[PDB]
Amino acid sequence: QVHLTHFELEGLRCLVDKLESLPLHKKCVPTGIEDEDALIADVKILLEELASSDPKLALTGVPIVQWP
Amino acid sequence: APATGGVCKPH
Amino acid sequence: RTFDLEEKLQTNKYNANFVTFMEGKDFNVEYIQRGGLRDPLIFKNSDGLGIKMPDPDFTVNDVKMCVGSRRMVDVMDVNTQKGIEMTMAQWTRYYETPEEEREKLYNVISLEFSHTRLENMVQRPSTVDFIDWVDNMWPRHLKESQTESTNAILEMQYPKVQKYCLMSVRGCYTDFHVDFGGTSVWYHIHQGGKVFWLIPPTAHNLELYENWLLSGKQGDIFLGDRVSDCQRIELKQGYTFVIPSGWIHAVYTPTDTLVFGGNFLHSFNIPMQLKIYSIEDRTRVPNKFRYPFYYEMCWYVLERYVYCITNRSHLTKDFQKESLSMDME
Ligand SMILES: *CCCCCCC(=O)N(O)CCC(=O)O
Numbered sequence: 001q002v003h004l005t006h007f008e009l010e011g012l013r014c015l016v017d018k019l020e021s022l023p024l025h026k027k028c029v030p031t032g033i034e035d036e037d038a039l040i041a042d043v044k045i046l047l048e049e050l051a052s053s054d055p056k057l058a059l060t061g062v063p064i065v066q067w068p
Numbered sequence: 069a070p071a072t073g074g075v076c077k078p079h
Numbered sequence: 080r081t082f083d084l085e086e087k088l089q090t091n092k093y094n095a096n097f098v099t100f101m102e103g104k105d106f107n108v109e110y111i112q113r114g115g116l117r118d119p120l121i122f123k124n125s126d127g128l129g130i131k132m133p134d135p136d137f138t139v140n141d142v143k144m145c146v147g148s149r150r151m152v153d154v155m156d157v158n159t160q161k162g163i164e165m166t167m168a169q170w171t172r173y174y175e176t177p178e179e180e181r182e183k184l185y186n187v188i189s190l191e192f193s194h195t196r197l198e199n200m201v202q203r204p205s206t207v208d209f210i211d212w213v214d215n216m217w218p219r220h221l222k223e224s225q226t227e228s229t230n231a232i233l234e235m236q237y238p239k240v241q242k243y244c245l246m247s248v249r250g251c252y253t254d255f256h257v258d259f260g261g262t263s264v265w266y267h268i269h270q271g272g273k274v275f276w277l278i279p280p281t282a283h284n285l286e287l288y289e290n291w292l293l294s295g296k297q298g299d300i301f302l303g304d305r306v307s308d309c310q311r312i313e314l315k316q317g318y319t320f321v322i323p324s325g326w327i328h329a330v331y332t333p334t335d336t337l338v339f340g341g342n343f344l345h346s347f348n349i350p351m352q353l354k355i356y357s358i359e360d361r362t363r364v365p366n367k368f369r370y371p372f373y374y375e376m377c378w379y380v381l382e383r384y385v386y387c388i389t390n391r392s393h394l395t396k397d398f399q400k401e402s403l404s405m406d407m408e
């Protein structure tokens with residue numbers, strides 16, 4: 001239903017792979033984060049479900065992430 | 069001396 | 080420095096065309112979504128960018144009074160490319176000294192002035208606010224809690240890398256580098272002028288760059304000779320320059336100059352951001368010269384994406400509550 005840019009999809013897969021593969025002493029999980037393993041798991045599911053993003057429809061002129 | 073971060077300089 | 084910087088400024092060989100001249104109105108989120116902020120941009124005027132600058136005759140002594148005579152400032156010794164420290168009042172005295180009376184060439188490129196009186200006198204391009212990870216991803220109650228106006232790491236509640244004042248005397252030179260964390264940079268020539276040599280972040284050029292850093296022979300080798308392609312370009316007074324993640328660049332100051340600029344990470348060139356970070360790690364850059372709280376920020380980025388798309392939060396209850404309270408303001 002949501003459409004990410006391929007820039008973002010590629011980026012987020014790099015990011016997840018990166019953070020997941022760091023050892024504990026370099027992971028730097030911040031104090032606001034609850035369960036970093038469940039967050040990772042969720043990003044992986046999300047990227048599979050968003051893999052068919054339509055590049056046209058993603059060009060909304062508004063970022064996905066904004067404060068309400 | 070206190071440690072700093074976000075200092076712009078080459079190398 | 081055993082290469083002649085004067086011939087690097089005179090030769091016509093750095094003749095690549097990498098920069099796009101743009102009108103401010105076309106620099107929007109749609110443009111970023113479609114292009115990924117991959118191309119260096121110059122805005123010859125500020126129409127449509129949404130910037131604000133101080134008064135056009137603003138002096139270094141004015142900067143000093145806004146941040147404090149006693150603020151410690153990192154200064155670069157141009158001859159060595161090493162850092163020293165002095166007070167802003169001492170920097171001001173050096174800067175107001177006539178050219179012939181200055182013993183050495185020093186440059187200030189790292190004065191971050193958020194949470195000082197100068198902060199509200201400078202506003203960056205609007206589009207940057209929409210995509211900066213600091214503004215859009217970092218827990219807002221942390222950012223708002225910052226009181227320290229220096230870059231003291233124990234006082235820092237967020238990555239304080241958003242607004243820098245650069246003060247450069249004629250003849251200053253900053254050797255080739257990539258901005259910290261793979262940040263993109265906006266850079267506004269308030270007064271004076273700068274000459275940049277720009278080198279694209281191809282896999283080959285980034286290997287050369289790392290190898291050049293690991294060799295320790297940066298005084299001996301002008302990097303812009305060692306690469307495939309390099310654009311030398313002049314920025315004049317009133318121009319605003321945007322430098323994408325990973326671009327290798329060196330800068331010369333032909334006249335006394337004052338610049339306002341700043342750094343941002345964004346969601347459209349993450350792979351390059353990570354790549355730069357890993358060059359810093361391998362070449363052992365001290366944390367002082369790096370993006371603060373880099374991986375922490377990356378965790379928060381993942382959380383925001385998940386939350387905004389699925390409505391499932393991976394923040395602690397207490398951070399959820401802090402965020403909810405702010406949504407209600
Ligand atoms: C990190 C501070 C914002 C960007 C300006 C410093 C810098 O990295 N430069 O490339 C400019 C160097 C200069 O003007 O001498």
Ligand SMILES: [Fe+3]
Pocket residue numbers: 256257258264328
């Ligand atoms: Fe730079």
